[PDB]
Design a protein around this ligand. Structure first.
Ligand SMILES: *[C@@H]1O[C@H](CO)[C@@H](O)[C@H](O)[C@H]1NC(C)=O
Ligand SMILES: *[C@@H]1O[C@H](CO)[C@@H](O)[C@H](O)[C@H]1NC(C)=O
Ligand SMILES: *[C@@H]1O[C@H](CO)[C@@H](O)[C@H](O)[C@H]1NC(C)=O
Ligand SMILES: *[C@@H]1O[C@H](CO)[C@@H](O)[C@H](O)[C@H]1NC(C)=O
Ligand SMILES: *[C@@H]1O[C@H](CO)[C@@H](O)[C@H](O)[C@H]1NC(C)=O
Ligand SMILES: *[C@@H]1O[C@H](CO)[C@@H](O)[C@H](O)[C@H]1NC(C)=O
Ligand SMILES: *[C@@H]1O[C@H](CO)[C@@H](O)[C@H](O)[C@H]1NC(C)=O
Lengths: 49, 299, 243, 50, 49
């Protein structure tokens, strides 16, 4: 039960925005120029780490 | 707390403090020709921008404010007020003229006609851009037609790439054979400049300054006096803009003729080459350590 | 005119074409660097020119090797169309100087030096802005590349044993010149000197660089003595992972 | 207020109709407007002080 | 072996940029005005912490 719960929580954590416009990398890349895109990608990277 | 029990406590650290300061800059006497880049009374087109190389001179950027009626700098890698302290390797100046609503396209990671077919900047650009209105000089009552820009091209342009060839763009399958027929176009349109247009449709003169980071021996930087060299003391040192604190000693490392710096595991500079006398020095932080206090109870 | 012919062959590069990636001193460390390198154990082309239709692509960089002694090779040419519609480089070397110009030259099919007139190389040069003159620069190895409008050249010459094939061991290359050319390059040509014409023969090795990650080993004196290519075989990948 | 729907949008030509300086976009970037595909467009026009 | 590896990793971690222009405090201080410098120093501080 503990292993399944931990894995499920880890998978479910991928839907958080962590303060960004969106939780999908492709949408952020397509909706913004790069220089505005690194600052959005950094929040997601830090949250997942 | 106001009372201390018996034991030994780790309180703080001790460190030796610097004595004086050292500045070491190379031998430069001439002055940079920043005046020629501005007020040139003639600027090239955007599709063929003008490039000038500046090296081996003392640079004083403040006087730049006295040559053109611009408002402020737009620098990316550094700050305009700190340009008088850094020391670079080479300087590049690119001059041209564009429309008013295209100044935003001269920036890293930008998309547009100018950025795709006329002038491209790298994503890691380190420099400044200065644009100012020139409606009084580049406008005629009947319309100026001496400035042109490219509109059609097979593919985009790499950063710092220039295209001069004038051909016939072929949209269709049939060969153009150098005639302006259907599906065949001339990829050069002339800007229409008139004094009655709005502020967004008026000519603008643009100059881009690009700096090279210190990897080779430095050649261009400001007028800072160079002091004497003293060793075997915890001192503050400044070598070509590299500032630090430590003890300088003669070094036994066998530097290659093209090497100017030495690094360590922690990515910290520990070996330097003096700009004036080509000698290798090594830097070691001066003494430091920790202090513990042993006491019985305050009672 | 067309009076020169060429023949091809293939051989193995073994482990050659290593250069210092930066002007930073290091010693007694192992450094991982990603750059443009010549892959280990790759085919390199052996060209025999005897008295040429050079359409040799530039790709992402060129490694050039020469083991001759008579000293007949002089300079190189770079371009994309090699006509008056596009600028092209004219790196030419002689006894006392090296001259680099990038103008709209109209080059011939077979360019060579009369020996010392360039009329057989190009016909005219109208528009250009960049010129350079400097001091001229056993197996000789050269590496040419261009990135973001910067054309960089590395070189190294070393005494060699009496062996036709490439040697076994390591020998690092060093940078000489970086220039702000900032044009498009797709093809390149090599120039030969023919006296007056008298027959001649030459041979050279050509290879192409690729983006690779390497693990270099620095000794206590600061020179590169060993390298590991991380994309050769699983053992090398394991070695790179374990550092 | 004007509603725009069921058409191909080319925003670049907007630069040729008014003598403005630059866009001020919030959710997206002006240079990326030629790739995204939306549901409806609304245009609100008025005049104010400087 | 574990102690040596941990100490070596801790020392090697000091060369990371963590999203800043440079990994050296002196270069950041000399290349920028202060108000642009705190935002660069903060990333390094957070990474080291
Ligand atoms: C700069 O160019 C202008 C062009 O009219 C000229 O009048 C002026 O004398 C030049 N020099 C300075 C210092 O402005
Ligand atoms: C720089 O100038 C000093 C004189 O102040 C001289 O002693 C030194 O040799 C010069 N160095 C170089 C590299 O020109
Ligand atoms: C080089 O090419 C030859 C044939 O042209 C081939 O037999 C050989 O396997 C190739 N070598 C490599 C390393 O691909
Ligand atoms: C080499 O070429 C340069 C420039 O073309 C010339 O000045 C020089 O005299 C030449 N040297 C020889 C030995 O031909
Ligand atoms: C320079 O380029 C222009 C147009 O690109 C061309 O008409 C001209 O013939 C070239 N040469 C000279 C000397 O102007
Ligand atoms: C250079 O020219 C070739 C041939 O026209 C073209 O395919 C290529 O996109 C151009 N640019 C580069 C960077 O190769
Ligand atoms: C390093 O240099 C010293 C001095 O020439 C020499 O004795 C030693 O053998 C060298 N070591 C290596 C590994 O090259």
């Amino acid at each position: 039960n503990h292993n399944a719960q931990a894995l499920n929580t880890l998978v479910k954590q991928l839907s958080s925005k962590f303060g960004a416009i969106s939780s999908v990398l492709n949408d952020i890349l397509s909706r913004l120029d790069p220089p505005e895109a690194e600052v959005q990608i950094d929040r997601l990277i830090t949250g997942r780490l | 707390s106001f009372t201390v029990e018996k034991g030994i406590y780790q309180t703080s650290n001790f460190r030796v403090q610097p004595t004086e300061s050292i500045v070491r800059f190379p031998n430069i006497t001439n002055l940079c020709p920043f005046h020629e880049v501005f007020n040139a009374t003639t600027f090239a087109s955007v599709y063929a921008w003008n490039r000038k190389r500046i090296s081996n001179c003392v640079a004083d950027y403040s006087v730049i404010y006295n040559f053109a009626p611009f408002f402020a700098f737009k620098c990316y890698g550094v700050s305009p007020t700190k340009l008088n302290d850094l020391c670079f390797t080479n300087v590049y100046a690119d001059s041209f003229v564009i429309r008013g609503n295209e100044v935003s396209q001269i920036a890293p990671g930008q998309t547009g006609n100018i950025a795709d077919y006329n002038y491209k900047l790298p994503d890691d650009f380190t420099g400044c851009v200065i644009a100012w209105n020139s409606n009084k000089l580049d406008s005629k009552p009947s319309g100026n037609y001496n400035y042109l820009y490219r509109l059609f091209r097979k593919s985009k342009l790499k950063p710092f790439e220039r295209d001069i060839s004038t051909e016939i763009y072929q949209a269709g399958n049939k060969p153009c054979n150098g005639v302006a027929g259907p599906n065949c176009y001339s990829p050069l349109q002339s800007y229409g400049f008139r004094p009655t247009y709005g502020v967004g449709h008026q000519p603008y003169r643009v100059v881009v300054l690009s700096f090279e980071l210190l990897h080779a021996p430095a050649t261009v930087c400001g007028p800072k006096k160079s002091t004497n060299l003293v060793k075997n003391k915890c001192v503050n040192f400044n070598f070509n803009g590299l500032t630090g604190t430590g003890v300088l000693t003669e070094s036994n490392k066998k530097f290659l003729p093209f090497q100017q710096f030495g690094r360590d595991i922690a990515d910290t500079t520990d070996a330097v080459r003096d700009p004036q006398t080509l000698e290798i020095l090594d830097i070691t932080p001066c003494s430091f350590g920790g202090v513990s206090v042993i006491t019985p109870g305050t009672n | 005119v067309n009076l020169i012919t060429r023949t091809q062959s293939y051989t193995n590069s073994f482990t050659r074409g290593v250069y210092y990636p930066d002007k930073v001193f290091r010693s007694s460390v192992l450094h991982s660097t990603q750059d443009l390198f010549l892959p280990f154990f790759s085919n390199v082309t052996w060209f025999h020119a005897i008295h040429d239709n050079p359409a040799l692509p530039f790709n992402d960089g060129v490694y050039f090797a020469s083991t001759e002694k008579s000293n007949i090779i002089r300079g190189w040419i770079f371009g994309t169309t090699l006509d008056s519609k596009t600028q092209s480089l004219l790196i030419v070397n002689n006894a006392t100087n090296v001259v680099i110009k990038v103008c709209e030259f109209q080059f011939c099919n077979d360019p060579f030096l009369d020996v010392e007139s360039e009329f057989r190389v190009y016909s005219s040069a109208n528009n250009c802005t960049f010129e350079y003159v400097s001091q001229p620069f056993n197996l000789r190895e050269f590496v040419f590349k261009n990135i973001d409008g910067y054309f960089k050249i590395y070189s190294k010459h070393t005494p060699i044993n009496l062996e036709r094939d490439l040697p076994q061991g390591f020998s690092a290359l060093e940078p000489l010149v970086d220039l702000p050319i900032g044009i498009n390059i797709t093809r390149f040509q090599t120039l030969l000197a023919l006296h007056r014409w008298t027959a001649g023969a030459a041979a050279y090795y050509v290879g192409y660089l690729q983006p690779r990650t390497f693990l270099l080993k620095y000794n206590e004196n600061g020179t590169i003595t060993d390298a590991v290519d991380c994309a050769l075989d699983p053992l090398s990948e394991t070695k790179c992972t374990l550092k």
